[PDB]
Amino acid sequence: MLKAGVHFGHQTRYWNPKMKPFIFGARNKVHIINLEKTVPMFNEALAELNKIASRKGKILFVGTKRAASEAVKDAALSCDQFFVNHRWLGGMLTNWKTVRQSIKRLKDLETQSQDGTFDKLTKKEALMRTRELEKLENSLGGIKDMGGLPDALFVIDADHEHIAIKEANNLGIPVFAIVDTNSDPDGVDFVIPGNDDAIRAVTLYLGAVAATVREGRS
């Protein structure tokens, strides 16, 4: 069922041929993802999310997409979980040993600039240290309270954040993504064939995941 959001199918001709199990060529030369097979895979994903979030595990939500930017922050801060939505830094997970002290720069700098020397040196120094905070803030803000390696990675576009998937396949993190028709379902453990570029879809999938997380925490 196309329940409330429209997650029917995608692009036109540059489909990844590994996703031959999910195709219907429409009259407008556009693929239709098999919506009667999408739902068992999505329920097989949520049955994993209740388990590893009732583990008290940490989900990391990833999607930039220029349109699913705010749906991740809004639809992930409703839980107790963590998000990366603006820019995916190369090596935030497998080079987290040196991303760590950049997080220490962010937390240890808003600690200095909420009350401390945010005016005590120079107007230009406030224009530097503040611009540093708005540069790191929408780069590490959702991952700031994590303080560890995540137990899962919820990717909204495999084709757009394919280096986050390979990133968390160097190490042993079970990633799972909603893939498009042109995406590659290889590193993704629990593939969800659907719509990556609809605001309705990144409300729907991410919202039901958000229900399985906070409803799953017992």
Binding site: V6, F8, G9, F24, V30, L35, E36, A67, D197, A198
Partner: protein, 351 residues
């Protein structure tokens, strides 16, 4: 089950390809981007300029429904072609009703012919028609109160290329492009054409039933080379253009766009070019032989170092006037060819 299959053919049945079914609800507004959701893959990046009506301000808040268009899918990410064209179909339907009605009555107000037929504008849009269509007889709306109210009675329409000439006043009265390419030909027939894509040397305005026009970069404005056509006109907009050239072989109608503010320059040469009119103008860059006042709508290079005072050679204008200041300067010569007005500053009261 087959619930989904039936569901799919149902949803096929309850949408169509063009901008026909008014379905996209406006779900976020921000200047300068509207966005809908007509049951397609993504959400349109709508301009604001497909949705403000006839005086410049927006008309539709959240929840409002206009259909857009289709048949083009995925340029990378996104979905549509604009809903404003949608509107064109509605206009066509009303015109068809008039033709269908046997006639169409609205209001048509046509002041003048860019290319031989008064221009008629219906609601937001303005269309161009062949010269006869504006008047039923030889009445001519030049003597009528300007931009007068009638309707439009149709005289002529071209049926493929969209040109419609309509009938103001007189209420009582009631292969294919290229063989006969002599209709808009003769030297300078002005046209109303939507631009399509600006290829950094060009603009590609092309409307008249399956042709291609360029208006490349040289005219476009009254500056030659530094212009970059994306800055100066638009994307997707119906403009002032006329032919200037049709080549029978090679199929390159080479239109133009300078046939406009050229007139403003001519007026400047005249308007203030009648004799020796005085002008209050601001200098912009003094280049060691002058001062280059360039006020009054793009009139280029002006006052020479020779006048400037009542001493000839020694003066060096940076010492004597200013940078960026409005001065006395009067015209003294407008040269019609080679685009040189030559103002002066010695016409003052010292001797």
């Amino acid at each position: 089950e087959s619930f989904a299959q039936l569901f799919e053919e149902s949803l096929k049945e309850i949408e169509t390809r063009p901008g026909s079914i008014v379905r996209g609800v406006v779900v976020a507004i921000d200047k300068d981007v509207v966005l809908v959701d007509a049951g397609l893959k993504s959400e349109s990046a709508i301009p604001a300029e497909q949705f403000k009506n006839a005086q410049g301000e927006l008309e539709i808040q959240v929840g409002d429904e206009v259909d857009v268009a289709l048949d083009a899918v995925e340029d990378g990410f996104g979905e549509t072609l604009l809903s404003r064209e949608k509107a064109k179909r509605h206009e066509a339907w009303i015109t068809l009703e008039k033709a269908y009605e046997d006639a169409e009555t609205v209001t048509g107000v046509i002041n003048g012919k860019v290319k031989g037929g008064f221009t008629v504008e219906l609601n937001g849009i303005r269309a161009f028609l062949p010269g006869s269509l504006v008047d039923v007889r030889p009445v001519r709306d030049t003597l009528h109160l300007e931009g007068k109210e009638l309707e439009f009675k149709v005289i002529k329409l071209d049926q493929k290329r969209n040109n419609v000439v309509v009938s103001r006043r007189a209420v009582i009265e009631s292969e294919d492009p290229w063989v006969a390419i002599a209709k808009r030909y003769p030297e300078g027939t002005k046209l109303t054409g939507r631009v399509t894509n600006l290829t950094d040397y060009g603009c590609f305005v092309e409307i008249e039933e399956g042709v291609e026009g360029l208006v490349h970069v040289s005219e476009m404005d009254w500056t030659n080379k530094n212009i970059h056509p994306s800055k100066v006109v638009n994307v997707g907009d119906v403009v002032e253009v006329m032919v200037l050239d049709i080549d029978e072989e090679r199929r390159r109608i080479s239109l133009g766009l300078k046939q406009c503010k050229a007139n403003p320059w001519q007026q400047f040469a005249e308007t203030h070019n009648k004799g020796d009119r005085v002008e209050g103008k601001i200098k912009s860059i003094t280049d060691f032989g002058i001062f280059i006042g360039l006020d009054g709508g793009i009139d280029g290079l002006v006052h020479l170092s020779d006048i400037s005072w009542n001493v000839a050679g020694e003066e060096a204008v940076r010492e004597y006037k200013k940078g960026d200041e409005i001065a006395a300067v009067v015209l003294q010569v407008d040269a019609e060819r080679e685009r040189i007005s030559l103002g002066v500053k010695q016409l003052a009261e010292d001797p």
